[PDB]
Design a protein around this ligand. Structure first.
Ligand SMILES: CC(=O)N1CCOc2ccccc2C1
Length: 435
């Protein structure tokens, strides 16, 4: 696989040893061959698992998830997908890696899609080799792949709200269950129901992932309520997966606003990854997978592919050239390569709005392309009446940096900035000039 001008897809089934067995072998071969190598992890939890599998090998950990300082003699670097993309966007110089390994190469976050596009274009150019590791490569129509031990697959009605009766099978279970809900707000309702009935529940989401995941190993639990984030290498020692088979989809309407559409069906890749959390121990056959809906290719028209084009258009590759998306996912968006390329100053504002402001890609592009500077927050208050953000059925209020109380009413509306309490609280601080 390590020969230049080649992109290999390591599509071994979930639990086949891609990270703990195959990855150190590739690293050993790249070090032997003097290949400047990058290892891309989806999340910080996977980076810490990779450190345990690669312990002893000379790897540079460019992540705060691993307590090891580099000696300066390493030729292999390990970082998250978002860190790779962020450094490509920032004026910091990134070496030209001869070998590019991306683990969980099915991750659909905008920075993951852009990293795949950038890496695959360098391979198409003949400048590098690449390995994409995933049980479900882009384009998979198999939600029921192979496992380490047999799994009982059961199509059933899965509750998406609190219940008084009709789901005896959910609570009448002595083992541990990992339940995939379509949203944080939906998971909070089911968790409160399970808690009320005497269960121990840990809730996992994108913003709380690192801190809460530790609790699954730290203490006994009955249920884990999680969003689609646990599809990226997160491992549990459970005997059942309850899968609603639903997810939220960010959609850009008329190129003017972003809504969270759905809950709607997950893709076959997500369904296989969610099912893949169980059936991992050959000594424990009979793990259960309860699914409550079918699959659909709901990645078509998803804002993440447009946001990935926004990122790729602003990453330098060679003179005027611009990286294309990885071919099996280049049709998920109707975008012209280069149409989001910003001028030097607006591009710097675009990067600061994402890195420091923590705004979604789409919202960061609207602000930067309008010629607004990072610290100018007037746009958070001068949108139309129907762009008013609501908190507890009443318009949200913030004190501006000028000491004046104003209704939060952005010029551009992105549902992601107020999808939950933590998101809205972070957007209030942004609109107040606090970061
Ligand atoms: C934008 C705005 O001021 N409003 C929109 C309508 O919703 C409400 C709800 C509660 C208090 C006040 C309002 C009025």
């Amino acid at each position: 696989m390590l020969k230049k001008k080649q992109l290999t897809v390591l599509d071994l089934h979930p639990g086949a040893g891609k990270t703990r067995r195959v990855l150190p072998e590739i690293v050993r071969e790249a070090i032997k061959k003097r290949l400047r190598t990058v290892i891309l992890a989806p999340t910080r939890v996977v980076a810490a698992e990779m450190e345990e599998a690669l312990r002893g090998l000379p790897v540079r950990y460019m992540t705060t998830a691993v307590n090891v300082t580099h000696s300066g003699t390493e030729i292999v670097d390990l970082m998250c997908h978002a860190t790779f993309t962020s450094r490509l966007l920032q004026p910091i110089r990134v070496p030209n890696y001869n070998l590019n390994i991306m683990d969980e190469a099915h991750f659909t976050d905008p920075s993951s899609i852009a990293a795949r596009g950038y890496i695959s274009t360098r391979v198409e150019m003949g400048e590098a080799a690449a390995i994409f590791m995933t049980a479900t490569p882009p384009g998979t129509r198999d939600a029921f792949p192979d496992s380490n031990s047999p799994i009982m697959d059961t199509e059933v009605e899965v509750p998406e709200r609190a219940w008084s009766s009709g789901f005896d099978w959910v609570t009448d279970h002595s083992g541990k269950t990992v339940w995939f809900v379509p949203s944080v707000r939906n998971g909070n309702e089911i968790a409160a129901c399970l808690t009320k009935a005497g269960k121990r529940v840990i809730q996992l989401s994108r913003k709380t992932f690192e801190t809460e995941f530790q609790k699954t190993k730290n203490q006994e639990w009955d249920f884990v309520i999680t969003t689609d984030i646990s599809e990226m290498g997160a491992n549990f020692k459970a005997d059942r997966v309850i899968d609603s088979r639903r997810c939220l989809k960010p959609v850009i309407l008329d190129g003017e606003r972003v809504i969270l559409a759905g809950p709607m069906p997950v893709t076959h890749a997500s369904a296989a990854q969610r099912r893949g959390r169980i059936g991992r121990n050959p000594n424990k056959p009979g793990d259960e997978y309860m699914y409550g809906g079918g699959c659909a290719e709901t990645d078509e028209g998803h804002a993440h592919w447009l946001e990935a084009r926004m990122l790729l258009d602003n990453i330098y590759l060679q003179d005027g050239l611009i990286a294309s998306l990885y071919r099996p996912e280049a049709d998920k968006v109707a975008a012209i390569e280069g149409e989001f390329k910003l001028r030097t100053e607006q591009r710097k504002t675009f990067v600061e709005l994402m890195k420091r402001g923590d705004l979604p890609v789409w919202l960061a592009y609207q602000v930067a392309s309008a010629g607004i500077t990072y610290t100018d927050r007037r746009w958070c208050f001068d949108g139309t009446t129907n762009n008013t953000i609501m908190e507890d059925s009443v318009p949200a209020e913030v004190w501006t940096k000028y000491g004046e109380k104003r209704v939060l009413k952005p010029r551009w509306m992105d549902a992601r900035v107020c999808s939950d309490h933590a998101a809205l609280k972070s957007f209030k601080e942004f609109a107040a000039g606090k970061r």
